[PDB]
Structures are given as C-alpha cells and as structure tokens.
Amino acid sequence: ANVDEAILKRVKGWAPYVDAKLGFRNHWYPVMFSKEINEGEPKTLKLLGENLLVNRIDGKLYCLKDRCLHRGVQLSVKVECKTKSTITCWYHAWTYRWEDGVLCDILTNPTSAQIGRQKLKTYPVQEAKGCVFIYLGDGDPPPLARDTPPNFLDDDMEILGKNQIIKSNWRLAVENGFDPSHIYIHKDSILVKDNDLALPLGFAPGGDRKQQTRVVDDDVVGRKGVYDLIGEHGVPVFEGTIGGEVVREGAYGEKIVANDISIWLPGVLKVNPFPNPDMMNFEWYVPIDENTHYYFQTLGKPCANDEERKKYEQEFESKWKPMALEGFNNDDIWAREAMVDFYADDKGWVNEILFESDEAIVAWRKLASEHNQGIQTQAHVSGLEHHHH
Amino acid sequence: ANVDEAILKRVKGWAPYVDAKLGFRNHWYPVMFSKEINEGEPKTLKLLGENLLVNRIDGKLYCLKDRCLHRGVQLSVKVECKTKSTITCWYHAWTYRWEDGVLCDILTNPTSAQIGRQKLKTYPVQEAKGCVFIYLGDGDPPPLARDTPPNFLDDDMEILGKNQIIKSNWRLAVENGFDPSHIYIHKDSILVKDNDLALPLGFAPGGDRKQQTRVVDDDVVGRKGVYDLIGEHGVPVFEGTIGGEVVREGAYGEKIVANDISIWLPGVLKVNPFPNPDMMNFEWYVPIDENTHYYFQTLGKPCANDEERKKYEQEFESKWKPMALEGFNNDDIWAREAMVDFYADDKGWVNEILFESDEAIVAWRKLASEHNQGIQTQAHVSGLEHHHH
Amino acid sequence: ANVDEAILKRVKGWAPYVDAKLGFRNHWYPVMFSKEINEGEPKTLKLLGENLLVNRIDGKLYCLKDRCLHRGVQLSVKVECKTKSTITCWYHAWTYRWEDGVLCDILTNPTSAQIGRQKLKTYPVQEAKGCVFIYLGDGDPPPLARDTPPNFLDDDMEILGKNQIIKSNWRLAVENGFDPSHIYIHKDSILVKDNDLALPLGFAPGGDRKQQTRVVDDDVVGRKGVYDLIGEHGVPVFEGTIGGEVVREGAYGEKIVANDISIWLPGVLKVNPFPNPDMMNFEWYVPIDENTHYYFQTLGKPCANDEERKKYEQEFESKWKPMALEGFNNDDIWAREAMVDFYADDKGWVNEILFESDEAIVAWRKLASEHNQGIQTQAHVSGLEHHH
Amino acid sequence: IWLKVCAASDMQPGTIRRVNRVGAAPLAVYRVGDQFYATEDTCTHGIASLSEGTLDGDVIECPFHGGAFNVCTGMPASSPCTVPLGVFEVEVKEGEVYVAGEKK
Amino acid sequence: IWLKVCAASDMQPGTIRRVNRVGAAPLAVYRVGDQFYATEDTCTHGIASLSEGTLDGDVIECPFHGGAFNVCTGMPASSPCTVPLGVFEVEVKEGEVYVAGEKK
Amino acid sequence: QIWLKVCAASDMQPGTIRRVNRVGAAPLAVYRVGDQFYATEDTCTHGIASLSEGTLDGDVIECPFHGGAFNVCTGMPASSPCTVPLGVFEVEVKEGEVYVAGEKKLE
Ligand code: FES
Ligand code: FES
Ligand code: FES
Ligand code: FES
Ligand code: FES
Ligand code: FES
Ligand SMILES: [Fe+2]
Ligand SMILES: [Fe+2]
Ligand SMILES: [Fe+2]
C-alpha cells in the first residue's frame, strides 16, 4: 500500500513491516511528558502523519484530531476554547466537545442540520509514569501494558527522560537500537570511561539461529517482542584486528551493563541494566511521518520514596541525562540518519547485505510483520477511501 | 488534466473547476498598477504559470512571453532592447517586435531562414482605472467589461488599491471571499470597531436553497457571476451560543455595509458598499502558479471632479488602505493559507463536509465550471502537445 | 531508462543522448587536481550520481564507492582508517582494502562468513597533468587518451586550471560551450578589451550541412568528437543589425583566437588557440547528478623547462585565471543555468526551435548518441536489478 | 402518516424522484426494479441532493463527492460518507406510491 | 514554371526525395503509394530535413522532434510544429514527376 | 569424509530442497531437479538467508529474504541483488543413496 508492489513481492519474509512506512496503527505511543501539557492549554503534535490536539480538562487528558470537519483547517491556527468542555473552530465556528468529538454547536448557524450529526475523530489518551500515551487507533483500546516493555510500569519504578524529533523513518531508529553489533559506534562514548563500563566491540556468535534470540508471543499481557541473546553462546570481542594485528580494544571497565536487550511492538527498546547496573533504559521511536520520529528516551530506577526519588532526579540531571541519554545515545541519532539515503527509495530493503548478528533484526522484522495491529496508510491521514461492492 | 482522474470522476457537479488548478485561460486578469511600469522599462511577472514581459512604448503597453523561442531562456535574465520597438535575446540575439512578437532579426546570423518565420507569443494588454489587465488567452479578446464586476468601469468610479503575492491556490482565495459564514473571522477587526460597522457572526438561512443565491448567466457584456442572497430571508446571528450559553456577540454598529456581495469569473469579488456606505470593494485572486496568486485589492468611490479624487486619495492612504485593505482583509489572507494542506493533495475536494451557507460556494463552483473560457494546463506552459500520423 | 519513453521516441536522431541525464558510464572523468588530494587524506565526491571516496596511499590514488555493503551508509560520515591499506566502516566495522575493495576483516565479528566473500566497488584512478581522472566504468579501462582532447597530454603542455560545482545538467554546459553563435554573450567580456582580441558577434553559414563540421571517429587513439567548421565557409558577423541598422559591432582586436573548436566524448571542449594565440583551453563538464556538474577548466601552454613553467604559473594566477577562466567564462555559467527551466521537465528536447549554427550541436548529439560507452542509470546508483 | 408521491407507473425502474415537503426537509424515492424505497434527500456528508445523483442497483451515489448509500438500509456504501441516511417507509397501494411522513 | 523532378519509378513507394533549388529553399517530394506530393523540405519548427523523416500515410514525421505535417495540405499534424508548411501541387504526366514552381 | 551420506534418492521429490548440516562447517543445500541432484552452500551469498527455505523454479533457487536467485547447477547468480557465486558441491547416487561432496568444486 505504501511501497512499490515489486519490492514487497521480493521481501517475502517481512513485507508488512517494509510496507509500514507510516508506522503501525492501533497501538499506544508516548508523545510527550505529563508536565508539558497544562490545564486548559491545548498542545499540537503530529502522530503517524495525523495532526492532533491534546488538552487537559480537570486534570484529565483529551485528544481531538487537529483538523476541522468543514474545510479541513487546523483548529490550532487560532485556538478558541469558549467553554470548558469545547473548542470552536476559528473559521466558521463549528464547535466540538473534547469528550466525544461531537459537533455540538455552530455559532455561524445554530440551525444547521450538521449539528449533532457529525463527529470529529478522537483518540484515547492515558498518562503513566509521567508520560503521555496516545492510542493512535480505532475502537476501545487494549491495556497500555500490551505496548510497553516489561517493568516500565512497575510501581516502584521511577521514570525520567527526554524527548525530541529526529529526522529518519522510525524503523531505522528501531533496527539501530536492537542491532547487536552497532555497539561499536559507542566505543568512545564518554559514559564508557566516565562510568567505568565494560563494553565489547562486537560479538562472535555461537550456537544455532534459533538460539540467537527469544521471540515473545506468549506474554499473558499480550506483549510481542524479541530478546537479543547473542551473548549467551557468543564470544565478546575485546580486541579488534585487521590482518591479525590488533587495531582497537573494547572497554575493560568493571560495570557490567546492557546484557539484557529486547525490542517490543510498536517499537520500544528495553536495555537492562543500563546506563548503570541498577537502572533500566526504555526508549521509543514514535512515527511522526515517513521521514521523522520522536526519540522518546526514559531511564528507570526503583525508588522506595521521595528521599530516593529526589536523589535519583538530581543524579539524572547532573549525570545520567548528559552522560548517557546524550553522551551515549547521541551517536545513535546520526547513525540512524546515516541510513536514510539507502532506504529512502525503499531499495535498501532489497540491497542490504546482512551478516550474522542481524539475525536479531530479522527476528524483529518477522515479529513486527506478524503481530502488528494495523498498517497506517496515507488514506488514514487524508480520509479513508472505499467503494463497498 | 491537472488532477487525478479518479478525483475528477467523483466531483460531478464541478469537475472542470477542480481541474482548474492553474486557472482559467482566455480571461482578462489585473496584474499590476499602471504607475508600476514606465516608458521603456520592461517588467517581469508570472501569470497562469507563464513567465511574461510587459513594456511601455510611446505610452502603450505590450506583452510578450518571457521565453525565447530558440533555447527557452527567459529574455529578462539580461534585457537587451536595442531599438525602441524590439527586444533582443541576450543568448544568440534573436530579435522580436513588441508589437506582434515576430522574429524580425537575428544578429548572430542575418541570413537565417528563421527570420520572419517564427513568432513569440504575445498577449493583449489594456489599462483601465489605473490597473493593468492582461488577456491570458488566444485569439481576439472579448471586451474587458466581460471579466470585471458591474460598475468597476463606471466613468466616475475612482479606483485605488494594493497588490501582493499570497501563498495559496487562487480558488481557496475566491471561496473564502464569497463564503457567507467566514464573516466570523472578522469579528475582532479594527475596522468593525473604528468604523462603527454592524457585523453579525453569521446567518441562519431562510427560504429555499434556490433563494440563497442569484446566478447571472449573462448580461449586457457577457458577465458570469453569482450573488450571495443569504441575508435576504436569513436571520443574522448576533449572539453566539454553546450549550445555550452566550459566549460571543456580533458587532452592533450603525453602519450597514456589504448588503451586496457577488463573485464573477475569472475570479473577482465585489462587495457593496464596503468598507464605508459610500464605497465599493473589488478584489481579484489572480493565478500565478498552482500554489500562489496575486491578491489584487481595489476600493472605488464615485468622484465628480479633481477635488473629490484628491480628497478620496487622501482618505484612502490615511484610513481605508490601513484599516480595511489591511486591517480587515489581512485575516482573509491567513484563513486562505490555512486551507492549503487539506486541498494540496486534491483530496479536500472530496472530503470537505459542507453546511448550509456553502450553497454560495457550490453555486460559484458550478458557474465557474459551466462558463469558464478554458482550462489552463501545464502543457500550455511548456508547449501544447498533440500526436497523430 | 531515465526519460519518459514518449519523449525518447520523439527524438529518434539522438535518443541515447537525451536519455543520458546522468552522463555516460565507462569513460574517464577529471574530478579534482592532484594537489587537492594528500597522503592518507580521504576525499569525498559524487560522480555520475555515485558517492565516491578517494585516498592517496604511498603516493598512489585509490577509489572506493562511499557506501558500505552492509547497511548502505557513507563510510565518510566518520572515516576510520585503522591501517594504511584499509578503511573501516564506523558502523559495524566492516573493513575494506583500498587496493581491491575486498572485505578483509570485520571487527565486530571476526568469525563472520562474509569476511573475504564480499567486495566493495572500486574504480580506476589516474593522475595526468596534475589532474585526477576516475574511470567511472566496469572492467579494464581503455587508455586515458581516448577520453581526452588532442594535445592535452603533450609532453611539454603545462596544465593549470580551476574546478567548481555548477548547477545545471552537464549537457547544457556542453552544448553552450560548443555553440558557435553563443559567442554573442562574450561581446563585453573584459578579456576582449584587456587582451586585444578580435571577436565577431556570430556567423553567417556557408556551404552545405556536412561542411559545417568534421565528425572524428577515425582517430587512432579512439577519441570521438566533432570540430566546429562554421568559419570555413561562413562570413563572420561584425556588424549586428536590426531593421538593417547597425546597433552593435564585434571586436576588432589584433589577436586571432578560438578558430579551432572541438567537443569530445565524454564531454570535454577544446578551444584553440585561447585565451591567447599561444595557449589552449580544455574544459570538462563532468556529471555529478541530474542537476549539477563539475566545470573543470584548464589552460595549457607549452613550457620547455621549470623556469618557463613558473613564469606561466604566475601569469595564470595574475592574468589568465581572473581574465579568462572567470572574466570570460563566467558568462557561460549563467548562460547554461538559464536553460535549466526549459529542459528540466525534459520537454525542451522537443520544443526547442533551432537555427543554422545549431548544426554543430546536432552533430555532437548524434556523435554522443552513437559512440558513448554506456548510459548511466539510476539502477547503477542504487544497485543493478535483474529478474531471472 | 403518509404522503402521495406518484403513480408506480410514472417511475421507470432505476430512476429517482425527489419529494418536496412543506415545512420539512426533502425526501428521495427510488425505484429499484419493482420495489420502492425512500430516504432523506440530503446527503449526510454535506448539502447535496441525492435525487440529483446516480442510482446503481440499490446504491445511490451522491453528485457532490461520489459518496454512496444503500437506499434500502440507508447505510454508507462508498466513502466519504459515514453517517447513515434516514430511511422512510414506502407503500404501493392501488398502483400508487405513498411515503411515510415519518422516518422508521 | 513547373520543374521536372524525376521519373515516377525513380521513387519506391513510401519514400521521400529532396530537391535542391539553387538560390532557393529545398523541396521535398513524397511518394505515397502511387501518388506524389511536395512541400518545402525544411521543417517549419527548426532546421531538420523532412526528406530525412518518416512518412506514415500522407503525414511526414520530422526526424528531429517528432513534429509532423500532412503532405497534402501542409498543415501541422503533430506538435511541436505550429507553422504550416509551404505546399507545391505536383503533376505526373507520362511517368514524369513535375512540381509547381511556386508555393500554392 | 569425502562423500557425505545425505538420504535415499527416493526420499526426495522432484523440485525439492534438503538442508544438510555439517559439524564445524557451513550447511549445504541439496536440490533435486527432475531425477538429477545438485548441491550448493545453503547460505545465500547475499546475506544470512537459508536457500533451503526458498523456492526452487526449475534449476534456479530463489532466496526467501530479498528475491535474489542462483542457478543450482553452476551456482552463478540468476537474479539481483545476488552477485557472488555459490560454492557448488558434487553429488552422486550410489545404490540409490544420495551423497554430497565434503569439499566444493574449484573453478
Ligand atoms: S473550517 Fe472549521 S468551521 Fe469551517
Ligand atoms: S536562446 Fe534566445 S537567441 Fe538563443
Ligand atoms: S553499515 Fe558499514 S559495517 Fe554496517
Ligand atoms: S455531499 Fe454527498 S458525498 Fe459529499
Ligand atoms: S525541427 Fe521538425 S519537429 Fe522540431
Ligand atoms: S540474503 Fe539472499 S537475496 Fe539477500
Ligand atoms: Fe546504540
Ligand atoms: Fe473576509
Ligand atoms: Fe562561451
């Protein structure tokens, strides 16, 4: 639907994934932090190509599509919330309820037959761990846990992080994140020295194909993902050689980290333990449009009370955020961007020459193709098209 | 021709209009004011996607297509008018007469067989009311009166105005201007308050839809247009309510304006009287290319003598221009721009959800579709194409 | 393959040429000057749409495609030359030899089955007259002389020049250069006056079509090109008229120049003698992508010793470069840019209305169409495709 | 409770007939074969008159944007339409078509 | 006035022959089946020789840009040609091809 | 040793593929085209795909990953993006028993 049929026909093992250029519909996605949206102050954002508006009323979040039903203008061009529970389009005053999107009034013509007979698209919104999740889908939403990695929602798990827009398709961000051998680009990260980490340069695989990963599709919660087990039978590379001569060495620090990595639909990575032996790293690559994504980074650390929460918060600002989220992950950002040209014409999905560790990426592509809840299409963006027969 | 055939097939009520992305060929269009072009100073512009050159020789205006017949370069890159009646291409010196566009000489080869056997496209140009009109069409032009609103050419009518380039397709401009309910965007205009105008928030229609408009299929000079009669049997709305609560009020001024509003092909609106009970407002939305148009604004007021003309010009510069042409119409500009995305992929022409007052727009779309004198195509811009034998 | 088939069908006399929007594959192309590439200092460039990396090792030049075989990233984003004879991708450490492109090591997995079983594309590189030529083609390359105009490689011919990226398709640059009548745009060049040049405004052709040019396809070194012979039977134009009245005159200087003009595949012009009666001007219009090209300008003057070479170099820097390469040729740059719009949609190749002197351009279009060594396609850029 | 439309003979199969009602919105009567159906005349997607549309079987296509509805059920058949059309009862008594002034 | 061009049999069916005229523009003589026609040889859109073009019925296609003309009327048949070709009536008498001296 | 016992010729239907795993070595793929047998490395030279999981069309095997293909008899590429030839291993049938070479042929 989104890609030349000749290409989809070639990638028989994961065509749905290759076709999912706009992301997967019917999944929850984090788009901002709770503290970024204030009471009565609608905020705009684009998710899966759709312009949305989020507002907080009586502390609860509501989401309406930011596109008037009438002439298709963004209501946000000139926000007019004239009553607590509604928003009035600045153009011809069509008024909608945040609660159900129903066109309840039209100031330019209170006798219009459209009143009460049209409805603006709304999307479920849920806040968890100080993060704002939007269910970009149709029908009643599944539990949030289904689209989050294990432990993210733990009661004692304190979540902190940052978010930003990155210029690359979401899939390139995902594959880079789950890529076992990309650890090489982190060899000079400040976190390595400054946090005394043990970090190999790569991995010499061991065992059979099936042993390289653990595909999860029997999670009682419904979670669908893959675990990277390359380290279970492999031999970590600490001395890189060329022509038999050592030209590079891994990091021989004491802190053991990132020995438990997994990727979960709709596209969230869990690195454990990281950036420190007593922490976890959860990062989402949320589709904005075919060329961009939100790089939603979160770090979690169990905290029994305000005491620890405050301390954690302090270290997050002074150390973890600058040394890890940025000092470590920044290289991930330009790495993703570096793959844009090769895959931009969709040809990269055919011409890529993979090697052993990409077995982890293949497992993900297959899992995503088989368990996604829907392929977002441009028609979903402009307006579904069909001619029942 | 210019739109997906699948879309044109759907809009049976006005396919030609939807197809007219580049504008209607064979109509007169104002592009600048007479004072903007002086004797012997060629001026460039783009109209209906075509690059044009206008020059004033012995007081009379002439228009040539700004594209050499030889290698297609714009003559204007380096203007060489070596004799009062001609223009020489800077590249290989092909020389054309402004009067008829004939290739009368070629300095680089005076023996060329092309001399006298080729003709650069010329377009009729006429100055009226200090405005420069170009007939972007083929063959003998019809009277200018056909493409101008009633009274614009009245002997005593004194015309003053402003012109600029706006980033939106010309049709979005036309529809916004003739939109009966768009008056809502002007509720806070400085003109309404500073000129004590009565301005409702909209209208509750009355009578049959047939009574909502008055189509003029022909008049003394072949004019084609539509009058907005929503206020004839409609009820002006002065109190905007939501859930029964009053949240906004119209303006209760004593000056009654805009009792007569009409749109005419090729796309010029007449508002009478406006912005004052003794004046008229005539505004064109001229197609430059598929994404932009000239917003050619004019205000007219009958003047019997030089004394009145001077007084009017003073009032225009000190009040009407900044308070009306700018203070009022600037909101029309951004409303216009807000509709670009929805119609940019041509899908808005199918997905829009219209309501009662839009009968005016529908009437215009059908009138435009039935009586335009030609659909400008990209082939007109590059060179008409036809193949057979 | 690059242009609408309906258009190609219309230009039966030179369809291959019109389709060659990305240039001709399997030809040598100059891309920079020798002094611009230093030992162990990799340089990036795009040629015929392909991103390339050039490096100098032990003095010799090597050229590798700047695109890792693995995930298609440019190695140049972060160059890692761990050893003198190899380059390691910054992403997963696939390491290639500059000499043959062989994937010889992979630091992230020394046991990988890909090691020694993949090869990154390499292209022949040759330095001549201080110019770096890359053979953007496949298989063993032909002698460089085949793709260079006559005398460029002469023993004593000292070559100096300038190079830059220009925003126009390479063909517009070629046609403007070999265009007999475009001489009109140079009528006010500072070179005309400052170097006392004789320069007509144009030419009134004489004789039949075949006499307007000399198509060269019998050259022993295999070079293919066309000589502009419009001046052998014509009548130079020195008095430009409109309605029979003189409105402009040519230049009546003493120095006779540019009466020996020829264009050669893959797209290099030779103007002789120019800009002075004892010099030659050789310029290439190298395809970078569909919209841009390198304007590789060179001026050659015979020099017998190091002493004369230095003299020439100084004159080049103080006079020839600013007065000719820039003072004269700068008008060629915007002239070619002015034709972009008309040909950008490929419709100009159909709608153009040609006149007599264009016989030279037509001759070139036909020569190029018949003797080019291959049409570069977008598939060559992304990866050749073929279904069993 | 019922309004007199026309004689079953006045409508050729596959045609549409608009029924204007005083002080009320218009209705549309369609003859699909030998059976008659009725719905509100105004397309739920805008202000178009469905009686000015094209009937194909039991599906009416709106002249404005190509949206469509099943005239029997009133359910949308083609995008962009999404809101069900109001359906009215029809009776053919004594070779004459009658439409329920009230929607079922 | 008339110019003796050649013997009808000198031209195979569907072929074109260029006729040079000292101190004048060359002409093109076309043989369509057993009929003969003539026009100016130079395409009106450029410098191409129509005698080096492709004849399809009574329409000559220019070798340069695919423009075309009807060789009987001289009117353009395909873009980009827009200027009509000069036509010269021809007469075949005793197996000899004659072409009018001046355009007509 | 030199010849690896694969299976009985009868255990393979025309147009099928069988994967042969070797301890301390890369897997092979045995193809039956009609009543003749051929063999190549099982791993696609263009990546990490298993050709034994692909589709055999005559004497051409199509890789399941990207659609590349090879001629099973010669091992030469048949469809892009494949460009590196497959190592071919001789196969012989002794007493209705299929045997594949332990070392690839050299050319
Ligand atoms: S576009 Fe929102 S009310 Fe008209
Ligand atoms: S492009 Fe104008 S004379 Fe050649
Ligand atoms: S992209 Fe170069 S080693 Fe992976
Ligand atoms: S008004 Fe009927 S489909 Fe839009
Ligand atoms: S020269 Fe004949 S069609 Fe252009
Ligand atoms: S792995 Fe077989 S074609 Fe790519
Ligand atoms: Fe990373
Ligand atoms: Fe307005
Ligand atoms: Fe030049």
Automatic annotation (TrEMBL), chains A, B:
SUPFAM superfamilies according to UniProt: Bet v1-like, ISP domain
Binding site for Mg(2+) 3: Y252
Residues annotated for Mg(2+) 2 binding in this entry: D196, Y252
Molecular function GO terms recorded: 2 iron, 2 sulfur cluster binding; metal ion binding; oxidoreductase activity
Keyword DNA damage: no
Top-level taxon of the source organism: Bacteria
Pfam families tied to this protein: Aromatic_hydrox (PF11723), Rieske (PF00355)
This protein's name: Terminal oxygenase component of carbazole
Automatic annotation (TrEMBL), chain C:
InterPro entries found in the cross-reference section: Cholesterol_7-desaturase, Homotrim_ring_OHase_catalytic, Rieske_2Fe-2S, Rieske_2Fe-2S_sf
Keywords, alphabetical: 2Fe-2S, Iron, Iron-sulfur, Metal-binding, Oxidoreductase
SUPFAM superfamilies linked: Bet v1-like, ISP domain
Residues binding [2Fe-2S] cluster: C68, H70, R71, C89, H92, W94
Rieske domain location: 28-134
Coiled coil: none
Gene3D superfamilies: 2.20.25.10, 2.20.25.680, Naphthalene 1,2-dioxygenase Alpha Subunit, Chain A, domain 1
Amino acids binding Mg(2+) 3: Y252
UniProt: Fe(3+) binding residues: H182, H186, D332
Keyword Iron set for record: yes
Keyword Oxidoreductase appears in the UniProt entry: yes
UniProt-recorded Gene Ontology molecular function terms: 2 iron, 2 sulfur cluster binding; metal ion binding; oxidoreductase activity
TM annotation in the entry: none
Full protein name: Terminal oxygenase component of carbazole
Species this chain originates from: Janthinobacterium sp. (strain J3)
